[PDB]
């Protein structure tokens, strides 16, 4: 029965999503062929998803979701390749994007001491994640998505609002 319930939520979404006349164009997932939604039986899968790998797991939200995002790594058409890093959220005012702060250390030989530095890194945040400031995120490298963006979020641990900011290299 579980499959039948899922299709109705998926099938229903594509309707009022069409009645959302404000949108210039009908947003759709490329892989699927529009027309399956007319099949009364659950003879075809209505949604597409993949496995990122590297030991990561596809969130249930993407599988049971109803959104469209070409740049999402699970439901879109982009791949994760290269370096995987960790950081904290600095800003989240953008539509589907954030700014990640990274902490490291620099060594000065003359004084035999260190300095604390920081950098700002922009990432694309899929609708499958809920993130606020100070959370810890894992980002994976991808192809250029914009002028300053080459990373996409794949994981995020939660944090509490009250927590004295602490220099956190990762």
């Amino acid at each position: 029965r579980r499959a039948l319930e899922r299709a109705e939520t998926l099938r229903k979404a594509a309707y009022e999503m069409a009645e959302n006349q404000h949108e210039r164009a009908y947003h759709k997932q490329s892989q699927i062929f529009q027309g399956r939604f007319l099949r009364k039986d659950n003879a075809r899968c209505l949604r597409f998803y993949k496995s990122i790998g590297m030991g990561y797991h596809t969130p249930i939200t993407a599988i049971n979701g109803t959104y469209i995002d070409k740049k999402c790594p699970f439901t879109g058409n982009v791949s994760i390749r290269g370096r995987i890093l960790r950081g904290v959220v600095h800003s989240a005012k953008m539509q589907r994007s954030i700014i990640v702060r990274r902490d490291y250390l620099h060594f000065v030989q003359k004084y035999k001491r260190y300095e604390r530095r920081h950098k700002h890194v922009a990432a694309h945040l899929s609708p499958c994640f809920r993130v606020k400031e100070g959370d810890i995120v894992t980002i994976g490298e991808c192809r250029p998505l914009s002028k300053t963006i080459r990373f996409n979020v794949i994981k995020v641990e939660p944090v509490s609002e009250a927590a004295k900011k602490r220099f956190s290299p990762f």
């Binding site: 790998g53 590297m54 030991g55 390749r81």
Partner: protein, 258 residues
């Protein structure tokens, strides 16, 4: 930025292992594209002039080659800059000299004289399996050779035996623990040993752990590990069994030789 490819090569910028004199001149031979790459090959002229000494200058090498006095993998070559690589076949019937090009312990090219029983085949490393036109499977080797319709049992990184006259696979040695290998890249070029362990890191290189015949252990990445048989080399190898001595022993040997 140069508007095109590079056709020269300064002597001071040449690879170290070619052993070219600093005062020889400003220029050095530039190998041409072929079976092997620039940093994994050596030109013919260097072998034929700076080692065997059968020639004293560029011109003599030109005449010798254009007269068709050298065979490479059963095929005469007339380019002085033709690249010679690893596990190749060198034949000069005029003086009945047959050599297979291998690596010494110190990390330089050498000529191993051989017999007529085993000069009809060469060993090659397979590192790419792909679908070509019409979907027909293919494979490639370290010497830029393609074979159509291989056996499904053959996988990547394996080693292949092929006749010189005909590029038809005879036997293939698998890549597995407990097999003799020859290192062909980096700090450990020329060392012979047997595999002990294999550790893989996702998305990056794969490291191989081997033990020499005398118990020495060393490591390297999978991109420069070559299989040469099952527990025993299939081919004849230099006098020493792939043992890299320490500095003390080399100094002692030099003193003895002096």
């Amino acid at each position: 930025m140069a508007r095109g490819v590079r056709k020269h090569l300064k002597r001071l910028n040449a690879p170290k292992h070619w052993l070219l004199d600093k005062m020889g001149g400003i220029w050095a031979p530039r190998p041409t594209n072929g079976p092997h790459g620039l940093r994994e090959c050596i030109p013919l002229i260097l072998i034929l002039r700076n080692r065997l000494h059968y020639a004293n200058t560029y011109a003599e090498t030109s005449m010798i080659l254009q007269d068709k006095n050298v065979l490479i993998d059963g095929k005469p070559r007339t380019d002085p800059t033709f690249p010679v690589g690893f596990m190749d076949v060198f034949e000069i019937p005029k003086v009945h000299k047959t050599f297979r090009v291998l690596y010494d312990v110190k990390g330089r090219f050498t000529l191993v004289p051989i017999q007529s029983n085993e000069a009809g085949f060469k060993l090659c490393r397979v590192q790419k399996i792909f679908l070509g036109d019409k979907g027909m499977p293919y494979l490639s080797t370290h010497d830029a050779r393609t074979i159509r319709f291989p056996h499904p049992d053959i996988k990547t990184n394996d080693t292949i035996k092929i006749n010189l006259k005909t590029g038809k696979i005879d036997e293939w040695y698998k890549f597995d623990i407990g097999k003799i290998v020859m290192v062909t890249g980096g700090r450990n070029c020329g060392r012979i040993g047997t595999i002990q362990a294999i550790d893989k890191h996702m998305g990056s290189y794969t490291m191989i752990r081997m033990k020499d015949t005398e118990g020495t252990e060393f490591l390297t990445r999978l991109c420069n590990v070559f299989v040469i048989g099952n527990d025993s080399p299939a081919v004849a190898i230099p006098t020493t069994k792939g043992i890299r001595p320490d500095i003390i022993k080399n100094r002692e040997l030099r003193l003895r030789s002096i």
